[PDB]
Design a protein around this ligand. Structure first.
Ligand SMILES: *Cc1c(COP(=O)(O)O)cnc(C)c1O
Ligand SMILES: *Cc1c(COP(=O)(O)O)cnc(C)c1O
Ligand code: NA
Lengths: 406, 406
């Protein structure tokens, strides 16, 4: 199909690991992705040969490290088709990026009596910062409800948007259900009210091309460690016209223009105004390598392979007795499920005993669990390095668990 | 002396680098330290063989990664002699740790009409968050002034501490002058007023043992990348009795106990309440390795070597014509200087042309520069892997620059 999963897997050293004496089947990339040698080695080589502080130090290594950091900002901006590299801020991850927007933009744009709209499928990262903001300023957090099939009940939007709505904060792809929301249309509607839209893209950017100009979203966030990259780094994109007006959030070195203890302090320009103190330079270098690696494979090639793998898994899972799936038939990336009346914790423990890593619990989406009237679900991630054989192991494992515990 | 600089240098791959065709002399560890292979490789090996999401996932790799992360928290806590591992919070760095205190503790404890005390030698990281807090709540930022020798004018403390003083925020070791402040005594005085004390320890923890119980500081912060460790990780220590009362700062997954869109959200216990979303697990593993590496060398051994190297450099620098040094004779770690009437930028450029990396500019301490009536200084860092020969190269370089540009 162009894509070769065996060639890709050869780049990921963890996929040779054994677990409990058995070949690992790592079906938990939606919690965090494994990293290819190209990414691991790019960061290690930077530490071994090129390391220095950044912030445009006088000397050669610092100047070169600074250039590498800004070149990754440019590469990230092209990856999401931002108009400018200066629309991207380096953060620790999706979570921090949402908190930055909620404090810097939210404190200046959301007032007492206003409302913000989220959905019932959001991850806690795209819930709690908004609850904190609503409590700080006296605003209301409104919620788009779910349908049984895991899609949003969009017929409720006329009831939720009004002349006090300032922001829609919405997931691109559900980390549990795999639902992809109709962002472009939702954003058109939000903008007709003058509301802005933040998109939580943490489960989208690894599965297919993402184009923030076509989406017209006002903010977009994602995390490097889910995009086959190092931990401790993520991206916040903000339209230039908004970002230029935002006040700083964290204060300290590098985000100032002048500091005076008698005349006060002035700030530098965006995006550097939002990056206080020494950045995670090693993580940035590794993120650049991850973007290069993913672009070289091709996100449309990845999307084709993953979609065929997902279709195969859904077909095979029909032969598991008493299996409940949650979410729509066209899901991306993740399959959420429960087996009979067995606790997800026990199902996931048996799968781990078989060498198969899935996630269990509430997946940082307690309101979603409550919608489905369950405390927890299992979740298998089917990423670009996973195989039909691993899917077969999952199915056989569930069949064995059902027979043993029934 | 026990310590062997040649043995230590053999662990640091960057110190073989050439710059401008010449052997690198890296005298800028105070901006960021080089890392030994043990640290680089510990992080790489974790990514190659053990990588998974943390937060106590069901499956083997996640459970083991979670245990490693909490074991590093325990190792860090023993390194600074905290009473408990649960008094330490993982942050990106010193800067973020100060911002966390300034928002979470500062918003709840500093009111209109109150005052906070800093010093004129602080880094911007230990200035700007407090300026932001003072502007948010209507409090006054007071300043301990400098003496000409780079020490604090402690006779002013009776004028600065009063019944409205809530916090002293103070550097352990100046990043420019190398002054070590008399923290234990200053903390006793602050506590007599009921004020708390945050210590900025970013330039202390690599030079000698640090014991927060003996200091009795209420908060202590430092950064991994200056302690021979990866970027993107640092530590905030807070006394348990204070930390347990502090509200969360960043919101999202992992820091909640329950999330409801109708009944609101409750928080988990400290320190995990302060760690929202996926942590920088790779950076944490690397920080654990850096602490192990430093402890194995011995901080009293490091302190002896560095102090002998500093004494040698100060003695040799007497033979540089028209050299101005800033700070006290007993400085740690850094030598700040200007050469004649030459701009620091030009001096540092010639040194870089000789293969010698120093920092130039305001060193994120504009109020300190202004105290000395200069726009900028040069700064040479003399760390545990630097040598007498590198000091000799610095001296010869300055002599050559003086002769060429005079
Ligand atoms: C992972 C995830 C987050 C949180 O990202 P972090 O890297 O943990 O900050 C937010 N939203 C979704 C949909 C996620 O899958
Ligand atoms: C480095 C430094 C800081 C800032 O630390 P980051 O790692 O850049 O956040 C704060 N204070 C002092 C004294 C420093 O040397
Ligand atoms: Na932060």
């Amino acid at each position: 199909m162009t894509f070769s999963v065996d060639k890709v897997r050869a780049d990921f050293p963890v996929l040779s690991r054994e677990v409990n004496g058995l070949p690992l089947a790592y079906l938990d990339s939606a919690a965090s992705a494994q990293k290819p040698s190209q990414v691991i080695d790019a960061e290690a080589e930077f530490y071994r040969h090129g390391y220095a502080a950044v912030h445009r130090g006088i000397h050669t290594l610092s100047a070169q490290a600074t250039e590498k950091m800004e070149n990754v900002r440019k590469r990230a901006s092209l990856f999401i088709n931002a108009r400018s590299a200066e629309e991207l801020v380096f953060v620790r991850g999706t979570t921090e990026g949402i908190n930055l927007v909620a404090n810097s933009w939210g404190n200046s744009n959301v007032r007492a009596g206003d409302n913000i709209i989220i959905s019932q499928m959001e991850h806690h990262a795209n819930i709690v910062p908004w609850q904190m903001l609503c409590a700080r300023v006296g605003a209301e957090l409104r919620v788009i409800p779910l349908n049984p099939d895991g899609t949003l009940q969009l017929e409720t939007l006329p009831t939720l948007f009004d002349e006090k709505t300032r922001l829609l904060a919405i997931t691109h792809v559900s980390n549990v259900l795999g639902t992809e929301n109709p962002l472009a249309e939702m954003i058109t509607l939000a903008h007709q009210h003058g509301a802005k839209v933040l998109v939580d893209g943490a489960q989208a950017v690894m599965h297919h091309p993402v184009d923030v100009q076509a989406l017209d979203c006002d903010f977009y966030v994602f995390s490097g460690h889910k995009l086959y990259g190092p931990t401790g780094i993520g991206i916040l994109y903000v339209k230039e016209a908004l970002l230029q007006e935002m006040p700083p959030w964290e204060g300290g070195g590098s985000m100032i223009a002048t500091v005076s203890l008698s005349e006060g302090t002035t700030w530098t320009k965006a995006p550097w105004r939002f990056e206080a103190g020494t950045p995670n330079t090693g993580g940035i270098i590794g993120l650049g390598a991850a973007l290069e690696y993913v672009s070289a494979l091709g996100l449309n090639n990845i999307a084709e392979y993953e979609q065929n793998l997902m279709h195969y898994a859904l077909s095979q899972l029909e032969s598991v007795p008493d299996l409940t799936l949650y979410g729509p038939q066209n899901r991306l990336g993740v399959i959420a499920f429960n087996l009979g009346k067995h606790h997800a914790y026990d199902v996931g423990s048996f799968l781990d005993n078989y060498g198969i890593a899935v996630r269990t619990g509430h997946h940082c989406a307690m309101p979603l669990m409550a919608y489905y009237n369950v405390p927890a679900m299992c979740r298998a991630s089917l990423a670009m390095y996973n195989t039909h054989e691993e899917v077969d192991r999952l199915v056989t494992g569930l069949q064995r668990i059902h027979r043993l515990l029934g």
